[PDB]
Design a protein around this ligand. Structure first.
Ligand SMILES: CC(C)[C@H](Nc1ncnc2[nH]ccc12)c1cnn(C)c1
Length: 166
């Protein structure tokens, strides 16, 4: 958990303009959060980037988890291996609002973070899930009480987030 170059937004939320994969390789955190879907199919976005950095080990483990346990619920999570990136990966499903899933579930999704003292995480429900990323940071700030280090891989978005937060 040797995080460097973060900006502290609140007592427990830090942010950096960085690729979460690169942060995980440098820091080897106890927990890295994946922005997952309910079948843990890591096709693109943050999920595809984390799985590629494990050379598909995350996807083979995820497929075995789903065959044995079934899919997650939207707003839910599971803990699996972090492989080479972290001790553990917390796979968290935020709502895909472009598919009609309720934006209320984004609070439930961020509540999963409170089971871990320190986390390296992305913005949930941003990207293909369709939520406004600044709204996602507001729900993170209002919901997460443990120590969260957010990596946002887009300098334009990072500057909008920092400016909106102050
Ligand atoms: C908003 C965007 C910058 C963010 N992407 C990322 N954020 C952080 N590390 C990353 N590595 C590769 C992509 C990536 C995103 C995409 N989908 N979701 C749910 C979040």
């Amino acid at each position: 958990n040797s995080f460097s170059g973060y900006l502290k937004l609140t007592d427990n939320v830090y942010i950096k303009n960085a690729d979460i994969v690169e942060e995980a390789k440098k820091v080897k955190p106890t927990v890295v959060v994946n922005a997952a879907n309910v079948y843990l199919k890591h096709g693109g976005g943050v999920a595809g980037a984390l799985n590629k950095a494990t050379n598909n080990a995350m996807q083979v483990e995820s497929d075995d988890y789903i065959a044995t346990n079934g899919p997650l619920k939207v707003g839910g999570s599971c803990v699996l291996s972090g492989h080479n990136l972290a001790k553990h990966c917390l796979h968290v499903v935020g709502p895909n609002v472009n598919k009609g899933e309720d934006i209320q579930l984004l609070k439930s999704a961020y509540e999963n973070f409170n089971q871990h003292e320190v986390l390296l995480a992305p913005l949930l429900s941003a990207g293909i899930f369709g939520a406004d990323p600044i709204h996602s940071l507001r729900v993170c700030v209002d919901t997460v009480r443990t120590n969260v280090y957010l990596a946002v891989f887009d300098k334009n978005l990072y500057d909008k987030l920092v400016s909106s937060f102050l």
